Amino acid sequence: GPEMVRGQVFDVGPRYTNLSYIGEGAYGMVCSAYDNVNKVRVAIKKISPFEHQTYCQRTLREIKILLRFRHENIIGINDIIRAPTIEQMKDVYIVQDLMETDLYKLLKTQHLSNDHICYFLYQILRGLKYIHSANVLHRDLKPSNLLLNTTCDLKICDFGLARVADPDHDHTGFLTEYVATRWYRAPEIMLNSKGYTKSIDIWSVGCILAEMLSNRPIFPGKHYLDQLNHILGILGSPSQEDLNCIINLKARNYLLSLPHKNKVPWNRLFPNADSKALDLLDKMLTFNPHKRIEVEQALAHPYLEQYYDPSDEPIAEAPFKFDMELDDLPKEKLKELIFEETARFQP
Numbered sequence: 068g069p070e071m072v073r074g075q076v077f078d079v080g081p082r083y084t085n086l087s088y089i090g091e092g093a094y095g096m097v098c099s100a101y102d103n104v105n106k107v108r109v110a111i112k113k114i115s116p117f118e119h120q121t122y123c124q125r126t127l128r129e130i131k132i133l134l135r136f137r138h139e140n141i142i143g144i145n146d147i148i149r150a151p152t153i154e155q156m157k158d159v160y161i162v163q164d165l166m167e168t169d170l171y172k173l174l175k176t177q178h179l180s181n182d183h184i185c186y187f188l189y190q191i192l193r194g195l196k197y198i199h200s201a202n203v204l205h206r207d208l209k210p211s212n213l214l215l216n217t218t219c220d221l222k223i224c225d226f227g228l229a230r231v232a233d234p235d236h237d238h239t240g241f242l243t244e245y246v247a248t249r250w251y252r253a254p255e256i257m258l259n260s261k262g263y264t265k266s267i268d269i270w271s272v273g274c275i276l277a278e279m280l281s282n283r284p285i286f287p288g289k290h291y292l293d294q295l296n297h298i299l300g301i302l303g304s305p306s307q308e309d310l311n312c313i314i315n316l317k318a319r320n321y322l323l324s325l326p327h328k329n330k331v332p333w334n335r336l337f338p339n340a341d342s343k344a345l346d347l348l349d350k351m352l353t354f355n356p357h358k359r360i361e362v363e364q365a366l367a368h369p370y371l372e373q374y375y376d377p378s379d380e381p382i383a384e385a386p387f388k389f390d391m392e393l394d395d396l397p398k399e400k401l402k403e404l405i406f407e408e409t410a411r412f413q414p
């Protein structure tokens with residue numbers, strides 16, 4: 068019999084055995100397993116994407132990116148199990164390093180010391196430096212996408228929404244749809260942006276920093292436009308200069324339709340926080356994406372001075388590229404690319 072976990076097939080033997088359910092991830096069931104080759108427990112997530120084009124797109128994005136990335140602060144893919152033949156292939160099993168928890172869970176239970184916050188933020192930005200050096204955007208950074216171990220080591224995961232950066236094609240309408248998690252969206256997303264620039268990830272990191280400082284999401288919008296109102300509830304109404312940068316006619320009109328809001332000083336929002344952390348937070352949560360701090364500058368910020376060290380901050384060999392643009396491909400074609408991409412792990 069293939070191994071079973073809570074009524075579900077988990078066909079990862081004989082190599083991986085001694086399974087334990089650990090949770091539901093974004094794609095399906097995840098277990099811990101004993102790897103009989105490397106003599107260690109690992110994480111295995113069961114993906115069943117093939118009925119839907121979007122699940123197929125995200126699965127392929129994640130696999131292609133994570134096979135190509137290698138970095139301490141980024142989750143790997145160690146092994147992939149799928150069927151010998153494509154018709155047989157209904158599930159893909161992605162094997163990853165087993166971690167202890169994620170930041171989302173840690174923040175439910177623990178107030179973090181300034182030291183831990185500083186180190187966590189370093190690691191996020193260290194990993195993001197590498198991602199960005201490959202001209203890749205994560206586009207869904209949030210606490211639950213940051214895995215942690217007992218040692219405070221941090222790995223960014225869940226690259227299903229990643230894209231190659233494309234600042235030339237960033238511009239789009241007002242009210243455009245967006246996939247990434249609401250609370251971590253930059254203001255421009257709700258205004259003129261498709262999220263194809265690096266500044267999109269920096270915003271999300273700033274939201275995570277705020278959350279590490281207080282154990283509350285800084286901008287817990289309930290709906291699309293509400294999110295932006297929460298943002299402006301802290302940043303205040305945008306400056307003249309920043310209004311003038313938005314090209315969408317609709318967007319700046321929408322902004323002018325809103326009631327004026329007073330900027331809430333960071334001092335006041337986080338009274339016990341390190342002033343250096345707040346200065347960096349300010350620079351990450353800047354309304355105008357052009358003026359927003361970049362990953363290398365954030366790393367070089369005084370707050371992270373005990374860690375910043377380019378000699379210990381690897382970068383990618385060269386820019387990433389999709390071989391095919393994945394969004395005009397039907398699911399049967401995406402299933403074939405997934406088959407191909409996973410063949411290097413077949414006996």
Ligand SMILES: *CCC(=O)Nc1ccccc1Nc1nc(Nc2ccc(N3CCN(C)CC3)cc2)ncc1Cl
Binds near residue numbers: 091169
């Ligand atoms: C990267 C995002 C992701 O894959 N997150 C996720 C979500 C649910 C379950 C697993 C999982 N991925 C990984 N988890 C671990 N380790 C791990 C997760 C959850 C726990 N919990 C212990 C307490 N409760 C029983 C709930 C589960 C423990 C350890 N490691 C690697 C990955 Cl990829």
Ligand SMILES: [Cl-]
Binds near residue numbers: 290291292293
């Ligand atoms: Cl809305």
